[PDB]
Design an enzyme around this catalytic site. Structure first.
Site, short mmCIF file in Angstrom:
data_model
loop_
_atom_site.label_atom_id
_atom_site.label_comp_id
_atom_site.label_asym_id
_atom_site.label_seq_id
_atom_site.Cartn_x
_atom_site.Cartn_y
_atom_site.Cartn_z
CD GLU A 1 -3.07 -0.80 -0.06
OE1 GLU A 1 -2.96 0.20 -0.80
OE2 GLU A 1 -3.96 -1.66 -0.21
CG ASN B 1 -8.56 6.06 -4.69
OD1 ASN B 1 -7.53 5.39 -4.76
ND2 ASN B 1 -9.09 6.42 -3.53
CG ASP C 1 -13.69 6.96 -5.95
OD1 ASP C 1 -12.66 7.59 -5.62
OD2 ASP C 1 -14.24 6.12 -5.19
CG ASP D 1 -6.54 5.03 -1.40
OD1 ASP D 1 -7.68 4.84 -0.93
OD2 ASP D 1 -6.19 4.68 -2.54
CG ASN E 1 -11.26 5.52 -0.23
OD1 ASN E 1 -12.49 5.58 -0.20
ND2 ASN E 1 -10.54 6.07 -1.19
NA NA Z 1 -4.60 1.37 -2.31
#
Ligand code: NA
Ligand SMILES: [Cl-]
Ligand SMILES: [Cl-]
Ligand code: NA
EC number: 3.2.1.17
Length: 129
Positions: free
Chosen positions: A35, A46, A48, A52, A59
Site C-alpha cells: 500500500e 483514486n 472516483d 487514500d 480511503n
Molecule cells: Na490502495
C-alpha cells in the site's frame, strides 16, 4: 516517516493488529508494504475522486474526512491528515473498523492481489517481536 519492516511489525503488534479479525501480523505488514512502502506520508488519488492516506492507504470515500470527497463519510471520525502522522495509532484504530466491515482484508485491493494466499509470515522474519 518511513518505517523499517520490523519497526512497523512491532508497532502494529503493540496496537493489537496481530490476529485482529484472524489476520496474522505478516498479513498487515505485507499490506502496508504494497500500500505505502511503509511510508506514513503516502497518498494516492483514486479515479472516483477519493484519496487514500497513510501506511494502510485508508480511503476518504468511507473512513476519514478530507473535505474533497463528495457524498463520502467519515466513519473513523478523523481528518484524513491524521493518517499521515509518524505515529500509526489513528491508522490502526481505523484499519480495525475497515477489516470488520464484512470482507476482511479484501477491503485492501493490494492485499487481495499481492498478499492473500502468500507466505505472509516472511514479512516478520528476523524481527525481534
Ligand atoms: Na490502495
Ligand atoms: Cl504472519
Ligand atoms: Cl468530503
Ligand atoms: Na470522507
Amino acid at each position: 516517516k518511513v518505517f523499517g519492516r520490523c519497526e512497523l511489525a512491532a508497532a502494529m503488534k503493540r496496537h493489537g493488529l496481530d490476529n485482529y479479525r484472524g489476520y496474522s501480523l505478516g498479513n498487515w505488514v505485507c499490506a502496508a508494504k504494497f500500500e505505502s512502502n511503509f511510508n506514513t506520508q503516502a497518498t494516492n488519488r483514486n479515479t472516483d475522486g477519493s484519496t487514500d492516506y497513510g501506511i494502510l492507504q485508508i480511503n476518504s470515500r468511507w473512513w476519514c474526512n478530507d473535505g474533497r470527497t463528495p457524498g463520502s463519510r467519515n466513519l473513523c471520525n478523523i481528518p484524513c491528515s491524521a493518517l499521515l502522522s509518524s505515529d500509526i495509532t489513528a491508522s490502526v484504530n481505523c484499519a480495525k473498523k475497515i477489516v470488520s466491515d464484512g470482507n476482511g482484508m479484501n477491503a485492501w485491493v493490494a492485499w487481495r492481489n499481492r498478499c492473500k494466499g502468500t507466505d505472509v509470515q516472511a514479512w516478520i522474519r528476523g524481527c525481534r517481536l
